Design a protein around this nucleic acid. Structure first.
Lengths: 71, 228, 49
RNA sequence: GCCCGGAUAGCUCAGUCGGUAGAGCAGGGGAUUGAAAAUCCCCGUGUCCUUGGUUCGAUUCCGAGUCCGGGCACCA
RNA sequence: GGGCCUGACUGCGAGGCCUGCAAGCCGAGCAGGGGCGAAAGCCGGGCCUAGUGAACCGGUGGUCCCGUGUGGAAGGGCCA
RNA sequence: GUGUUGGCUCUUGGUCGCGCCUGCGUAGGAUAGGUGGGAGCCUGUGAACCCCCGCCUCCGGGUGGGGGGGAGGCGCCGGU
RNA sequence: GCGGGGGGAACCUGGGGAACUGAAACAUCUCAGUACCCAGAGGAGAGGAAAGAGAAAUCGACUCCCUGAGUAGCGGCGAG
């Protein structure tokens, strides 16, 4: 591993697709899109005591950095 | 910031920030105006209807008891005994198809026409063309046609006051005297509150009684909160 | 879609019976008759688009 | 199947936030006319699509009807 | 050719045409209910043999049967 | 669109709330925008006579103000 | 001064994860979360004391067997 989160796990899976709708509107589901993909967050940082970083990931980030900001 | 009305003092009485409530109204209005003679206060208002598609066009009358003596004249159109009953009841204009004929000619001094089913044909067809879209012709569920000419004109004196949203969705009516009786004008304002409220067609969606007020003939115009 | 369009009969709010019909000649004119299961027979009327 | 716009002079189209119907072109009439024009004046016709309600009245305001025009979405 | 009128009715049918399937097709007579004569009776579309399409899916006018504790309801079962 | 992607700011549009402050087809002392109350209203102008000044226009006029003073004006009445 | 790492026929948890063939075509669907690449704890891990069941004022950790219906049902409601 080398890109999950830092403040927990948000690094993985995704199966999905579509095709089309038109249901409780006028009929059944134009059904189909057998597709697969990724799905994730972002990066950023601050300072320990003169010289630092963070890295981490998104939200978990914001709350967190706040947290150790507390110290 | 200075304006064209001596009423200005009365206006100072007038602090338009609150919509207040009914009884308060009786008092502050009674105090507010007693100019020449004694105020002829009235209530007026507007409802979220649409009078073009007459499927909401309302009118009728509650029975604001009072004692009474002023506002909205009416023609008791019938014959002998009905002239008796309604005239005595509390009529401003009285007679029959002879009065109808006089009107066709050049005499019309009544806002609302109430005729008994005995001269109703002459009233509605002879005077139909005359009273017309003025609001002066009799209609079978517009507190304007029936045998109880006496009962309805009677309340006109003990006290009448009717209803009839005008072009843009508003009504006007007497619901208390100046130095009044005030409680009276209140009560009648009420009976109207109710019958009107009832008439309220199910075709309304939201703020129905939009504007509800008391205004006089030639005089003041202030909204009233028929709640208090 | 041609001068042949399908309508059907319904009766004074107390039922509805069916059957297709047309468009051509007297177009709209649509009273007619028929009898619902309303009461025992009854006018019906027809019309209904 | 919904969602918008229109309906006016023969043509194409203006149009009070309710009081009059108006352009532009076609068509016609005289002067001008090597001459074609351009010029130049002058006109012609209107249930303002239909049916009712609002109003003292309504091209206009609202409902409904038919039609044409636009668009947008599906279709076993 | 004229008059008057909706049965080109719902409930339905016994019993047969053809057909292996499903089809499609013929129908006296009983009921409610009317319409043409006064009536003996005809009328459950046309003078008849072609104008036709499963099943799924979904719509609308019912109905007022079902509802995943109970009241209702999304939703949904049968009719048209 | 939305998330890190913070700061000041020039501004311009739709919408609903109130004001105009506004409302002149036509007889209408008169540019009545309605529908109500509805013959009276008012004197910090001691007044509609006069003065200018603020504002909106279809000549007019409507409206809001500063002043100038010596029971006055207008709504009524009628009338269109 | 510690720990691991390195293995291991099959069983095992999670990580990622496919065409055939069926649907006598085949794009939803299907085989299936199956084959296989992986990481890893074991001697077996897995799960394991309820924001559960289920509607009786009922049960009571988790796991595996028989039954629960192949009904309840999921669906080019078709193969399945």
């Amino acid at each position: 591993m080398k890109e999950g989160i830092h403040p927990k796990l948000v690094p993985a899976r995704i199966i999905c697709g579509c095709g089309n709708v038109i249901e409780t509107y006028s009929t059944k589901p134009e059904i189909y899109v057998e597709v697969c993909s990724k799905c994730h967050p972002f990066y950023t940082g601050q300072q320990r005591f003169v010289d630092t970083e963070g890295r981490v990931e998104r939200f978990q980030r914001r709350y967190g950095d706040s947290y150790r900001k507390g110290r | 910031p200075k304006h064209g009305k001596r009423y200005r003092a009365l206006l100072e009485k007038v602090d338009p920030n609150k919509i207040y409530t009914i009884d308060e109204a009786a008092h502050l209005v009674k105090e507010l105006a007693t100019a020449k003679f004694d105020e002829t206060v009235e209530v007026h208002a507007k409802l979220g209807i649409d009078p073009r598609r007459s499927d909401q066009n309302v009118r009728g009358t509650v029975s604001l008891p009072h004692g009474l003596g002023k506002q909205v004249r009416v023609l008791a159109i019938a014959k002998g005994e009905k002239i008796k009953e309604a005239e005595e009841a509390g009529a401003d204009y009285v007679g029959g198809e002879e009065i109808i004929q006089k009107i066709l000619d050049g005499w019309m001094d009544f806002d609302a026409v109430v005729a008994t089913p005995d001269v109703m044909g002459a009233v509605g067809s002879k005077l139909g063309r005359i009273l017309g879209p003025r609001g002066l012709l009799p209609n079978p569920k517009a507190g304007t046609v029936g045998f109880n000419i006496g009962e309805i004109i009677r309340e006109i004196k003990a006290g009448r006051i009717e209803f009839r949203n005008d072009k843009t969705g508003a009504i006007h009516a007497p619901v208390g005297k100046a130095s009044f009786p005030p409680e009276k004008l209140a009560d009648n304002i009420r009976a109207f509150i109710r019958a009107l409220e009832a008439h309220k067609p199910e075709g309304a969606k939201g703020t129905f009684l939009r504007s509800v007020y008391v205004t006089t003939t030639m005089g003041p115009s202030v909204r009233i909160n028929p709640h208090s | 879609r041609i001068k042949l369009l399908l309508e059907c009969t319904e009766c004074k709010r107390r039922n509805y019976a069916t059957e297709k019909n047309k468009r051509n000649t007297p177009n709209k004119l649509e009273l007619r008759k028929y009898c619902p299961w309303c009461r025992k027979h009854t006018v019906h009327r027809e019309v209904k688009i």
